[PDB]
Amino acid sequence: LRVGNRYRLGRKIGSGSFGDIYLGTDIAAGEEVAIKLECVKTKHPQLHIESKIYKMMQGGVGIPTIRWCGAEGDYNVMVMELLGPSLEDLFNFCSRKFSLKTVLLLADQMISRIEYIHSKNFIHRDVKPDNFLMGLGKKGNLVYIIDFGLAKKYRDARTHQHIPYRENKNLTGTARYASINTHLGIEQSRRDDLESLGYVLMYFNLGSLPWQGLKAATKRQKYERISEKKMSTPIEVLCKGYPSEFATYLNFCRSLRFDDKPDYSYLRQLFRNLFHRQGFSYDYVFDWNMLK
């Protein structure tokens, strides 16, 4: 299979519910690429939007490059830089066990990516291990963020005027990691991304969250089943037997006002101090770099 003249579609490397991702070859440049395909069917496809957001993000550390956008037949096409495995894939590879050092190494970078997205007037609204990828080669130590499928402006580009507080929202992201605010149908802001990262971190520590694996025919039902267990579990019980810093983090994030600018530095500082007190070095050796 080919896409136009310049690209070679290889084998599928990811299924997204938005589109599917193929490993590919830029034949004209002699470089491996990732190629996202979306089928056009209505007059509101969303890959055109996602690519316009990627482009506004460019020149960010841990933002993949976009090489080409256009259409062939009834498919929208996005060609981007190829990245390594997801943190979900790496977790599975490491037997669903990460060391505290690996979790803290990741935490520092994952706050910084989210910060950078917020600095560009957007919230992500789909923060999950699947959506963080390690780079390849010289970028093997660099955590990337992908999938701006569900991203939106939280403040005016011009004025920095925050979006107003609104309720009864469409529950559209992944329920395992959704903020308590998202569960009550409250409009998402910067605090919701950072809380979601909190649940991602405790996911890596535990191996699973105590609200996982609950069957539902519907997306609405998935959120509601998880909501009950989540809202009945104190931050302090969730994180018990782990460094206080994981509690302090989730607590800080839940205490933020709708339209508060987070202290991204403080949250980074928390994990750094724990990191140094444990006696770890920032050598960028994750558990999987030790595989012989």
Ligand SMILES: Nc1ncnc2c1ncn2[C@@H]1O[C@H](COP(=O)(O)O)[C@@H](O)[C@H]1O
């Ligand atoms: N540029 C990329 N390079 C490598 N894998 C990717 C890339 N983009 C997406 N993927 C994979 O595709 C999966 C789903 O992509 P998405 O539906 O866009 O979030 C992710 O979990 C990744 O494993």
